[PDB]
């Protein structure tokens, strides 16, 4: 009876595992609304209002998915699968989501506002707990929208559990640079502030937390 | 257990009682004393938080421009009154639904009536008009209850400064129309207390 | 008869599941040549 | 005949109501709110009328 | 517990009264309107003031209709059954403010105008709940501006 | 009068069979109504095409009060609005180039 | 239904250890707030490194997610096993009774 109820437990972890993978892969599916988001703009597209409709779809079927999932099953498993898989895939969703394109200072506020909306969404699933991917990815993609190399040294000396700091630091580098690399046109650009980000690639980037190589 | 004692006097010609056996029943009396006095504690304790409404900014510098009623003093009070009398009137029908209803009119009326004292000067702090508002919410408690409760009610009608003239009496007898306006909106909520 | 223009849905017909479950496009893997340059792009 | 009774009921009666209403709130229309408010008499459609 | 319509709901409601199980009957009925309003919320935040206005219109309007359904169905069924209705009413009003606060998590007061107007819509059949919203304003006075 | 089911004499699925029915009749007759609204977009001219949508969106809407009515309902009437876009579009100031004249 | 034949069931592709194994360690309490972005980003982005997001994808959003029918199925049977394991895992009544 221990092999029996053991096997039933194995079906429980398999099944709830499959549900958590389903919601999480629905999210990572849904982040491909950015792929393509039809040329997330260069330095601006002002205006620049709103709101990347696929993300509203993600909020929608996320919301109804939690509605019916709260209908049928019991509470604690739903809070478990939804909590862990939702917040974590939100964070790494922003992380790989950084690898996009040339960047927009108004579109910083656009994708910022969208990211704040999805923070309000997974928050609307659960927010009393540590809904910190709001704070982490908001200050991290905002930190990408930040173009100060002094802030690039200052932040990540104080915050940002940003383990993709090779691509993250190379991406905010590619964001101050993505403002630089089409600041002019032909060139677009001279890479002189990216000579200061070649030096700051060695200095504001390759002083990388005593593993000074990025 | 009374009929179990009488039918327990069957073969049993003991006497039948000796109601010193019914010390147990007196124990039941004490158990009854512990029982309702438990719950009539906590509701009263919850009605103690009644004083969070009417002290805070009610009968304050109060214009009170003819909202009929606005008596959140009496509104949320009579709400949780009708919540308790709601959720227990079926099985415990004509239990302390009725008895705790009467005692709720009591503790209601007394912990009400000692708020008019500190604003006994009857315009505090803006209540020249809200004289008639405290007259109105004072008149709200005439739903279905008893008369000695209404005696202490009309005792609290004369509680403040004016509240001593008969001009207050016949004036509120003219102010009865807005009370009738509260007696249709809101009607169906506290209609259960009838 | 899965050629480079008639390999996907004619093999996905009703009784064309008498061809294989991953050998629908490779229904001529029963032949000399299997299915003409990448027979096996369906099961994944 | 049954379909003509159905779209008779909705197209003749219902959109007359939800365009007749709202009239309180602009747009926002033809949707969940008018689903909620209409809901009137002659909602009694689907009991027997084609079944 | 299954029909989105009125006629079976009306009918088997008064048939359940015709058995004489009225309290269970009303409770199931209120549960059907609970699940009803519940699932009516499932059609869509898109942006906030719209969403709140929507939400209030569903919940309060259906409660008011449910009151006419009540006095309709429970003809001379007294005070007690009405008190059970007051239970369900107050429940749902609290659930409304819970859904309001459920996204304060980031408002402009025209939302509140929608709400208080419709709550006075419940005062058309005579039930105040504005005071709960007054305490809601009181303890939630951050983004009301 | 399919989903009047005292359910179920199939029982497949436990009230999910008619979803497959109007699903599939959505699917097969979709591409036929496609060209029937595309060819036959010219034969869906800027006249009672408005009454075509008016006699479709009502029937897109009072559906079950919905059950899976998506790809026909959204995509089809979407393309109908694209047709009214193009028809009113060439019917716009190109057809008011008399004012250019 | 695996028997791949003919489907890149990326959910089932995401049924691969140690991501499935640490996912069972992330199913243990579940994870008890050690919800490792190491684990979550590693396994859940590992097969999904295939594009990755990205950019410019070759990836999901109707590329082989489970349908709503199969969702209501899986939700149904998981509700069933939850109702099973109390009622049928109770009676072990030590040790052959």
UniProtKB/Swiss-Prot annotation, chain B:
Superkingdom assignment: Eukaryota
General function of this protein: Component of the exocyst complex involved in the docking of exocytic vesicles with fusion sites on the plasma membrane.
Note in the entry: Present with 3400 molecules/cell in log phase SD medium.
Complex and partners: The exocyst complex is composed of SEC3, SEC5, SEC6, SEC8, SEC10, SEC15, EXO70 and EXO84.
Family, similarity comment: Belongs to the SEC5 family.
Entry protein name: Exocyst complex component SEC5
Taxon lineage: Eukaryota, Fungi, Dikarya, Ascomycota, Saccharomycotina
Portion of the full-length sequence here: 778 to 971 of 971
Swiss-Prot record, chain E:
Function as written in the Swiss-Prot or TrEMBL entry: Involved in the secretory pathway as part of the exocyst complex which tethers secretory vesicles to the sites of exocytosis. Plays a role in both the assembly of the exocyst and the polarization of this complex to specific sites of the plasma membrane for exocytosis and to the budding site. Also involved in assembly of the spliceosome.
Compartment list: Cytoplasmic vesicle, Secretory vesicle; Bud; Bud neck
Positions spanned in the full protein: 604 to 753 of 753
Stated name of the protein: Exocyst complex component EXO84
Family: Belongs to the EXO84 family.
Superkingdom as given in the UniProt entry: Eukaryota
Quaternary structure note: Component of the exocyst complex composed of SEC3, SEC5, SEC6, SEC8, SEC10, SEC15, EXO70 and EXO84. Also interacts with SNP1.
Swiss-Prot record, chain F:
Subcellular location: Cytoplasm; Cell membrane
Family: Belongs to the SEC15 family.
Other notes: Present with 4280 molecules/cell in log phase SD medium.
Subunit-level organization: The exocyst complex is composed of SEC3, SEC5, SEC6, SEC8, SEC10, SEC15, EXO70 and EXO84. Interacts with SEC4.
Job of this protein: Component of the exocyst complex involved in the docking of exocytic vesicles with fusion sites on the plasma membrane.
Name by which UniProt lists this protein: Exocyst complex component SEC15
Species of provenance: Saccharomyces cerevisiae (strain ATCC 204508 / S288c) (Baker's yeast)
Protein's gene: SEC15
Curated annotation (Swiss-Prot), chain G:
Top-rank taxon: Eukaryota
Localization annotation: Cytoplasm; Cell membrane
Function of the molecule: Component of the exocyst complex involved in the docking of exocytic vesicles with fusion sites on the plasma membrane.
Assembly and interaction partners: The exocyst complex is composed of SEC3, SEC5, SEC6, SEC8, SEC10, SEC15, EXO70 and EXO84.
Assigned protein family: Belongs to the SEC8 family.
Protein's name in the database: Exocyst complex component SEC8
Organism: Saccharomyces cerevisiae (strain ATCC 204508 / S288c)
Full-protein interval shown: 679 to 775 of 1065
